[PDB]
Design a protein around this ligand. Structure first.
Ligand code: CL
Ligand code: CL
Ligand code: NA
Ligand code: NA
Lengths: 314, 314
């Protein structure tokens, strides 16, 4: 019923292990009634300024990940979601699905139990536990290649795995870097160089898929592993990375290093933790990631018609 | 009347020429009834986690500047304000005062006209024009030293002025850098090195004042000048920088390059613009900065008691 000359975008912000999720409850344009993938294509092609308004400065930051709530195609699903970041659109998003599901509870839309969530890479099954933690049974994960040699410009040779966990990842253990929260500047520079190296080498996932997430793994006395993860827009993931941990489990499974049902405890560069396990499937594994999200803001974004930076600063 | 186990901070976000201001309307602790400077001391010493919760990730970003609304000491003032950023506390804040005053109009607390605003460095006089632009008559500005030689580590010799405009600035024209929005990475690195150089040299403002803002000036065919400004937490100012432009006018005045009452049009690295003029005063000049602010969000920040990152990620 408001009539002033501005758009209102209703959002609820949460974070999962420190990684933010900006849930868009209302205010984006219609994207039609097709699959989440088809809607993502319309959003990206026709209405990308809505992403930038929500994610980029002045209203956002390069770290943020957004989640657009959509009516799902199947009436058996709780929701559809399209995830996006400072550079573009994600496939699946583990930390974000945890955030969305926790947020839907706060909105009074769901209770504890199993909830199907449609995404541009397929439907996932999220269990909202009685403690309000969330387990996300992800799409199929698999390793495309193992121990791929790469000369990292400015640093020297490494070996990495290429794997899909709902996004494409390059996974490295022999990077020679110090994985710690006080070292994220150097880690960001290193991982950015890795990605430049993959591009130069023409190294890709299946069917030429761009490898746009980089994971650096390290031993951790308190957990199974700690990682630093560089995301497609060159911000790092504050969380253990749900899709990246899914990809890691595909590698561990294929190497006989983690049995089905066994729990893997993955820490992020800042010390937050996800619990993960998998079952075998045809062509890969089906991993489940469990973590917690906390609410951090309820807001209405205001997009004033006369504001030259209404769609963000690009 | 809410009773869930979380704190609520009510905020209204705006931006001034792209530079954000997060106005805190309610939710911070009591800081006593002294001057804004005395309240700032209490906030910084006892309750700094409230700054980090509002400004830092996950709820904020390194770019944000906050403004805490306070009841002023003098009943003749519209408001008192304490400004803060990702690293600490500012003195005056030009873009932020424009934001605060525009926001107070939106809140229905003031109308067009002249409004006194108390700050930790003295009271300023803001005029809210009928067009909702704001002129801020700043505190006294003055130049402390001219053409100070500095060997910038990694780059080579420059000359800069040291001046106060409500914060301390080093102002350089002969930096050899390209002042443009597509070059902010290199400008940030250069200005950071300048500041390292000042520290090494023991170069300060009056009474050993830390020079924590760096301004790089360039000619501009559309304006009097364009600048890149590095702020104390090493984020850059998206605006022309009200206090930095105030400092620039003190230098121009002292050099006989701008007459009292003449208008100076200062652009920022991303192309936003302030209009500035001054009058002579004892010991310096009194500059007035005019610009516009746009609303960008209304929000309640949620600080959950059980959220390990409730006070921000440090
Ligand atoms: Cl609009
Ligand atoms: Cl709390
Ligand atoms: Na361990
Ligand atoms: Na000019």
């Amino acid at each position: 019923y408001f009539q002033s000359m501005m758009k209102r975008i209703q959002i609820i912000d949460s974070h999962t292990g420190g990684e933010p999720t900006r849930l868009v409850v209302s205010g984006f344009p219609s994207l039609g009634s097709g699959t989440m993938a088809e809607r993502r294509d319309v959003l990206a092609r026709e209405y990308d300024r809505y992403r930038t308004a929500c994610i980029l400065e002045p209203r956002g930051s390069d770290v943020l990940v957004g989640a657009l709530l959509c009516e799902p195609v199947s009436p058996d699903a709780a929701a559809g979601v399209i995830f996006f970041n400072n550079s573009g659109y994600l496939g699946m998003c583990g930390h974000g699905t945890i955030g969305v599901v926790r947020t839907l509870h706060h909105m009074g839309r769901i209770g504890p139990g199993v909830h199907r969530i449609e995404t541009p890479v397929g439907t996932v099954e999220a269990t909202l536990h009685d403690d309000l933690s969330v387990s996300v049974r992800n799409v199929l994960a698999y390793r495309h290649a193992k121990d791929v040699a790469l000369d990292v410009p400015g640093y020297g040779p490494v070996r990495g795995d290429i794997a899909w966990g709902g996004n494409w990842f390059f996974l490295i253990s022999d990077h020679g870097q110090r994985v710690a929260g006080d070292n994220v500047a150097a880690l960001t520079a290193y991982a950015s160089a890795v990605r430049e190296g993959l591009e130069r080498a023409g190294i890709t996932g299946a069917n030429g898929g761009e490898i746009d997430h980089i994971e650096l793994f390290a031993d951790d006395p308190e957990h199974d592993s700690r990682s630093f993860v560089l995301c497609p827009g060159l911000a790092y993931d504050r969380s253990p990375c749900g899709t990246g941990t899914s990809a890691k489990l595909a590698c561990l499974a294929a190497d006989g290093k983690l049995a089905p049902g066994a729990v893997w405890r993955q820490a992020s560069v800042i010390g937050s933790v996800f619990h993960a396990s998998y079952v075998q499937a045809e062509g890969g594994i089906v991993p489940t990631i469990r973590g917690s999200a906390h609410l951090s803001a309820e807001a209405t974004l205001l997009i004033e018609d006369d504001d030259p930076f209404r769609w963000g600063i690009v």
